[PDB]
Design an enzyme around this catalytic site. Structure first.
Site, PDB file in Angstrom:
ATOM      1  CB  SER A  65      20.456  20.329  33.367  1.00 18.14           C
ATOM      2  OG  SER A  65      19.136  20.360  32.874  1.00 18.14           O
ATOM      3  CB  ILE A  66      17.371  15.831  36.227  1.00 16.73           C
ATOM      4  CG1 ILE A  66      18.453  15.287  37.109  1.00 16.73           C
ATOM      5  CG2 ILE A  66      16.354  14.839  35.806  1.00 16.73           C
ATOM      6  CD1 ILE A  66      17.574  14.652  38.282  1.00 16.73           C
ATOM      7  CG  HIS A  76      22.860  27.561  24.523  1.00 19.73           C
ATOM      8  ND1 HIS A  76      21.669  27.627  25.182  1.00 19.73           N
ATOM      9  CD2 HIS A  76      23.706  26.621  25.047  1.00 19.73           C
ATOM     10  CE1 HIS A  76      21.870  27.082  26.099  1.00 19.73           C
ATOM     11  NE2 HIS A  76      23.136  26.278  26.159  1.00 19.73           N
ATOM     12  CG  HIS A 133      22.708  30.511  31.985  1.00 21.15           C
ATOM     13  ND1 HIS A 133      22.309  29.514  32.964  1.00 21.15           N
ATOM     14  CD2 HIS A 133      21.811  31.226  31.883  1.00 21.15           C
ATOM     15  CE1 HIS A 133      20.944  30.015  33.361  1.00 21.15           C
ATOM     16  NE2 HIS A 133      20.732  31.187  32.713  1.00 21.15           N
ATOM     17  N   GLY A 134      26.503  31.743  29.253  1.00 24.73           N
ATOM     18  CA  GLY A 134      27.649  31.680  28.790  1.00 24.73           C
ATOM     19  C   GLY A 134      28.410  30.392  28.175  1.00 24.73           C
TER      20      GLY A 134
HETATM   21 CL   LIG Z   1      24.070  29.475  27.957  1.00 24.17          CL
END
Ligand SMILES: [Cl-]
Ligand SMILES: [Cl-]
Ligand SMILES: [Cl-]
Ligand SMILES: [Cl-]
Ligand SMILES: [Cl-]
Ligand SMILES: [Cl-]
Lengths: 310, 310, 310, 310, 310, 310
Positions: free
Chosen positions: A106-107, A224, A220-221
């Site tokens: 992720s930029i 967090h 998204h696992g």
């Molecule tokens: Cl996550």
């Protein structure tokens, strides 16, 4: 984008060191006629050094591309250097270089770490070990999960003994800003990777129910919470399932922390549990849209009455 | 302008060192009453040091001259220093000083080298040997021809294994900007002074036919192509012939690389070959205007079809 | 958008008159809760008058929509009034109102007519008959085809005895500007709907080959040429075929002027002839991408030699 | 402020006409030394006409007062004229003048009516009868209650068959802007003073629960809802009770529409019912702060699921 | 300056009408070579009409004069027109024209009247009789003294039943602004030319003692008070005595209202009484500087205690 | 605010060192959910270090608080560092830390010292001993009283052998500016804590009577005069009495220098003497409002006559 969009490997003494690209070398590559057999190879701009492989032209914004990154920005060099300091802290060996540079990252995550590291108030400015730990998590080269101290960062809007809530500042980013101006997303990290008492959970849920009632609490696992508009939670499900499906196909392990069932949005907990159980996209995604009518009753009322007073 | 417009010689230990002028010393010279016998001699402004010979007042822009250079500009000092670093790398001896300072050079060429040398991305910033090589070519004190690595510079708009195409940025120059705003010229340098395969030639010709169909592909004989508007190619012929005629009169050798016949505009190849054969200006210039109707057929069509797709 | 996005019908003396919307009435509609049975009915904002049917919310730009029109713009009222002056010049009867208001029209076309009508130099400023003729063509309520005098307008970049070439100014539009800034399209109208001599055809083709070599010469069948980037001609084929397919399904007649075969791009003439002959999209669209190697030879050379001279 | 802060009475033919003040006459009054017996009398500034009574200096902002109005503003004259057009539509007789001018009115309400009347899209611009009806309600000289068509105005943010919701634009006001920039208040008017179906009630409640969950739904008894932050509802209770207590003391009738029990915030409905029953401030205000735990279940869930879809 | 600096006389039907100058005609005069016998005669600029006599060049600001007026200003025309409307209201006869145009007037006074007449709030905007009365006083062609209604104007800073106090706005003037930025002067006019009760006198004195303790209360004899810095009262004495001495020499009557002895500064009352008695400048001016130690005791204390309260 | 609003204690080698807060750590604290038992304890923002105790949120300006300080300002860090340099010059021991950090100090006083210390002209820039002396007085950790050399600072507007008068620049402050723009207060410090001759007293009184006639000369007992508007002297009495009453209740000694009776405003000298004698607030505050009619006669007249001359 891939890590190869910011640096190229240079071998020194049987250990690899990674070098940031010059943006003018990228600019020369974007105007280059290249054979098909050379689209994966690093490009020599005679004047500005090595440039990324021409198969990555999509990643860079040109007058014809607005879905890439702003590489002519000072933040590009800063992010590239941050990647290199992390990759140089490892000693990547010959067999691993292409896979490490193949990693998609992720930029916006990396830009927010630059924002933290250059802030003298932030602990990342003062601890090269913490900065390296945070970056290695960001580039998928660490076992540990993102917590508060190693967080991507942003604006703190809530904090208690167990959680820190960040406003993601993607609309203000230099390198790859989100273009819809209607975007708002938050992120709740664990202060410590540890069991969390019920009162600290209630404090978080009460704040999310009262202050963020129009947002879904999902994940998204990776350890967090993501505070996301309900109108966009369907798109998150697509991306989450594409990732889970990829690792099953690619054979790489799928470790998916469902997180606290009392915090996660019920439908999302159902869609992710069903995905973990091996259901198809259509099966578990229909659980997002079906209203399951069935914790912490009266939490919203308590907060509202505290506002009526004071 | 002449090299004497930027520096004066100062002898040290039987070897000459060259010193840039102060622009205020030039400003004092422009207001000076000078004898005729002293118009070739360097001028002493008491306050600001040595100034160029008063015979060079034409070279400097004043309210009465707009066809000179902007010497009160920081770029003047930068260009003058670049000239001095090159001249000091030679050890010009007494017999040679006046001829070296008599050399006429392209100011716009020297400004573009300054732009390269002060750019940390550019290799000229990092290699004093390459910077000195490039400058010595620019001031006519080198045997080698300009290639990509030693190029004057500008904006890269095309590159392949054999060629680099530059947009000449003369409208943005500080010292001697081109004043017609309708000016556009490009320059194609050889990446390596070496035989070039046919596919790399086709790549260049296809790009010039498609992207620059309104431009003539010519050369001034010094080893690289100039991409020039057809409406101005007649003026280029005048200047090219004046140069070729000068060296025959002045006795200095005329080495004129006609370059690749498959790339050069046919009429220009005829005008330059006829000039090399010793014809008069009228004879060989009439070949520019006569339509000779008679490589790489369908190159323009292939590029156009690649645009219809994708 | 549909004509119902700018006006609502009001009956007076057995003849319909059309009334422009207030943009604040549209703004009130966009915030309205409406039954499903009322999504096609005109909306009463108590304060600002009648508003378009709520099924048209897509057509208006909001913070959530950027693919509609800027209705809060003065140009919206001007375009709406232009539509009403044309619709009031007809005497639409009860059976026709819903179909006339169902007509889909080019908003950019209507804005350019406003630009013409408010320009005192333009003949449309002075001839209400010509302005009404031009608008009725624009809203699909006229038999006549667009020619120069009734053209949508823009910047004249070429003109001869038979043709006028316009630069379409869509990037500067107030109401529905094209958002890609890389957009360039031109339009060649016939000055008179009449047979055209070969010399006036050669003049046009020579200018398109020389000045617009990177553009395809196509047409959408309505009597004028569209000068379009080759990279976008595939999208034009999709829209042209969707229109031709719609009228066959909808039963409305498909009259498609292929225009001059010596001017139209060869592949486009093949794709449109094959479409007219009744082929499927895949069949005739493959003719766009296949290079058919096979008028007016040396036209490009003549123009280039005229540039070398003068 | 009192109506006497904007106009003074002038008798003509046994019927009173009201004249707006000049702001410079007010400015002269604020610098005037006046006897105590003359503090209630209108002030003669020799130069700028009649000025309000010096007992009203509090109402005007000076360098020493920031809790008054900006009388040197064009909006002051516009509001004063609006008051005069309404007062001149009545024929106030001698016995009534001082009481009419004693009436305390909301300046922000009157400014918003000016904003409506000067907007050509607004019906108040076109109906002097509706404008006069709206103003007479605003200045307490009408039996009718404020509905949508006669509303104070602002930004429409929700509308259905029965209700219109306005954002109160007090932070942007010229004459008496609210100075806390954290202020947000909305207002829901009835489109028609009529029984309202349950579905139109559900539409309103669902929008208030989802979009305005941090706001209390209350009323001041005059026939419309006020959407107010919970942190400020205690202050609203004070002002509402002060008004109700005043009319009991002053003998003027207290008509208090509690409005729909299914829309009003439960605690506010209890505090207002108890006030109507004649309880003391302490008794009925304690009902605001006590959590009464006990319509339209699942309304919030339905809206949220409609966001997850689409 | 003289009235002839703004207008020239033109005879019509045995009655004179006065015409404002064009500023370009003045500009032409300032560049004119003129005989000595013609320095008093009006100047014909061929292009811009009649110009003032060249003996008045001092009165106009040029690059060499900063002690004149800004005649190229719109205010010049406005002041000139105001003079003409007043002079045309008289019917000046041939014998009187040169004396009327010889009258020296205060330009700043006339500009302030323009400021009043163009203000719709000011009574001078609405009463041509009052405006003409005020101007005729200003140009010394009226028996009446300046009172409040006919005052020069400015900012009202105090007012009571008997007096109005104005701040003179000379630093903001267009035509002849005072250049020392340290200038502050006030002016107290009588509201009515009538005996004034003691309480209204005390109100004025208390305000001058408290709010203007650093200012002298003086008068130039024309019926109103001037509130003037003590550091400049010596210069006022010079000008006042020069005027009084001029009228004795010129034979014109010296009517000098000493005004109220309880308001005027004691030393100034002594200097003006002694001047009226016929003493020399040195005699009566020494009374300004000598401290005469000897009304309304405790007025300053009462005001101060009213500030401690409230 | 309390000293704990700028720094937290850190023990090193049995001696305490104080560390400034980061403003982002304060920003994180303001968004924190905290137990009641932890409201007095220092707050750990994981990212930005230690933050002040959450019981001090009032002290910091947020969108909801405008009565605190602007902690996100560079001046906050500068003031915090100034506090720490002073506290580190002491060696605060464990028993004293909480009391020292409990000390309430004037933020505006500390900001003015920063302004002095960063001015190279000011002696505080050059003497760390004088700067530390001044700060220790400011934070109530010194026996000495503020004199000129150790003064808070501001603009010098009067000076003689004994006194220096400062204009307090609170309207321009970064950290805690006074918001009423009508504020003006001055401060007269003793140049030396020594008996002062009568002529130097007369010089001060004459300047205060002439230049500051609308100001009361009072004191808060700490050894210097405060020049304060009469309209605000009642509020000063409240604060002065609250302080004197606090120390009697808190047992800490009340040492109140009444200062020179010939300089202090008579009523204030009475109110403070009566307070020192042990009277109630009502008793001694009534002496402010009662006019006691009863030095240095003719001082105001002498200054005025010196202005009439020169
Ligand atoms: Cl996550
Ligand atoms: Cl060349
Ligand atoms: Cl078409
Ligand atoms: Cl209400
Ligand atoms: Cl006077
Ligand atoms: Cl004090």
């Amino acid at each position: 984008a891939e890590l190869a969009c910011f640096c190229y490997p240079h071998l020194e003494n049987d250990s690899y060191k990674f070098i940031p690209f010059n943006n003018l070398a990228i600019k020369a590559m974007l105007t280059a006629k290249v054979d098909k057999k050379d689209m994966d190879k690093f490009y020599d701009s005679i004047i500005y050094g090595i440039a990324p492989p021409p198969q990555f032209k999509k990643r860079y914004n040109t007058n014809d591309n607005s879905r890439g990154m702003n590489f002519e920005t000072i933040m590009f060099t800063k992010v590239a250097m941050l990647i290199c300091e992390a990759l140089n802290s490892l000693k990547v060996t010959q067999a691993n270089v292409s896979n490490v540079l193949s990693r998609v990252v992720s930029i916006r995550h990396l830009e927010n770490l630059v924002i933290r590291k250059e802030n003298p108030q932030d602990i990342l400015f003062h601890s090269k070990d913490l900065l390296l730990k945070s970056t290695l998590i960001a580039i998928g080269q660490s076992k540990e999960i993102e917590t508060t101290i190693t967080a991507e960062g942003g604006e703190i809007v809530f904090q208690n003994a167990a959680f820190t809530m960040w406003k993601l500042t993607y609309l203000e980013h230099q390198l790859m800003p989100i273009l819809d101006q209607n975007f708002i997303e938050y992120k709740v990290t664990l202060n410590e990777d540890k069991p969390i008492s019920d009162v600290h959970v209630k404090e978080l849920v009460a704040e999310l129910r009262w202050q963020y009632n129009k947002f879904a609490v999902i994940t998204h696992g990776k350890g967090h919470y993501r505070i996301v508009k309900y109108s966009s939670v369907a798109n998150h499900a697509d991306r989450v399932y594409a990732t889970f499906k990829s690792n099953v196909k690619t054979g790489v392990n799928n470790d998916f922390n469902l997180l606290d069932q009392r915090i996660i949005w019920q439908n999302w907990y159902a869609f992710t549990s069903s995905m973990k159980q091996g259901n198809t996209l259509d099966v578990c995604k229909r659980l997002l849209f079906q209203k399951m009518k069935p914790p912490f009753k009266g939490l919203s009322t308590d907060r509202k009455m505290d506002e009526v007073a004071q």
